[PDB]
Structure 1
């Protein structure tokens, strides 16, 4: 068991203790059936990894000076040309959607052909950190905690841009410049009666 999401409350009896990220958090009892719970473990790890790469991408776009994560498809929404680290990309939106559909269909289909593989190893694990079977549980726990933080961070990116309309680094600049005069309660959107 990783910890306790609400102290003193008992853990649900369907969440096994030797599972990464087991804080006993299931109020709506969504994982009481084992096949559903197996699918949710798979989907939780997959969503966490995609959200890690997404938050790292949004941070690396905005910190390095190439707009925010919202300005990045605007060359294809408008009439423009792609760019990457300043270097141009000589492709159009239809061609890139073709490349992405073929590549993601192949990779996703090869992942889905496997039964319940979450932690494959082998070619996916070239540096051999999970070849120990004793620190592997600690690294999976670190992996699911960074992934949950990344999911919460990307939904924060989306909700913050829906409300204020700026990037997360500029929003953090405003929150450092005036923490009381710039937040979700000085927003005017998140709480309507403030």
Structure 2
């Protein structure tokens, strides 16, 4: 058990102790049925892995000076052209949709057939970090914890942008400049009567 989400509470019986990232958090009892929990366990890791790529990508674009995550696709609607690290990409929106749909369908179709294989290893573990079973326990916990953090972080990007309209790096700079005058309570939307 990683820990307890609510000190003084009792962990649900249906959450296995060995399950990585198990803090006994299921107030709605969504994972009570074993079949439902099996699907949700895979879905959480898949969400976390995408969020980690999504958050890392969102920060890299703005840190390197190519804009924020929100304005990246505007070229496809304003008649512009795609760029990657500044170099033009000849493809257009229609071509991108077709290639992405085919590429993802083939890749996600293969994963779907495997039947909920969260940790395949092999070709996906070239360096063999998770080759050993004993060490894999801690690494799985680190993956799910960083993954849960990334999911929350991306929700922060989306919520913060809607309220303020700025990028995640710009928001961090604004908060650091005037911490007490730039926060969620002063954006005029998060807290109503102000």
CA deviation profile, 1:143-171 (whole Å, cap 9, x unmatched)? 00000000000000000011000000000
* Counterpart residue number, 1:46: 46
How many positions carry a matched residue from both structures?
A: 194
Residue aligning to 1:171 = 171
Point out 4+ residue stretches in structure 1 off by more than 4 angstroms. Answer: none
1:92 equivalenced with 2:96 (yes/no) = no
Q: Give SS of 1:73's match.
A: helix
Residue 122 of structure 1 and its aligned partner are, at CA, apart by 0.6
Deviation, 1:192, is: 0.8
Structure 2, gaps ≥5 residues long: none
Deviations 1:172-194 (A, max 9, x none): 00000001000000010111113
Shift of 1:8: 1.1
Q: Distance in 1 between matches of 2:31 and 2:188?
A: 37
Q: Secondary structure at the match of 2:69?
A: coil
Across the aligned residues of Structure 1 and Structure 2, the Cα RMSD in angstroms comes to 0.5
1:50-99 Cα offsets, whole Å, 9 max, x none, are 00000000000000000000110000021010000111101000001011
Partner of 2:127: 127
More helix by share: 2
* Post-superposition offset of 1:3: 0.3
- Aligned to 2:123, what secondary structure does the other structure show? coil
Q: TM-score, normalised by structure 1?
A: 0.99
- Alignment map for 1:143-162 (pairs within 5 Å): 143-162=143-162
**5+ unaligned residues in a row in structure 1: which ranges?**
none
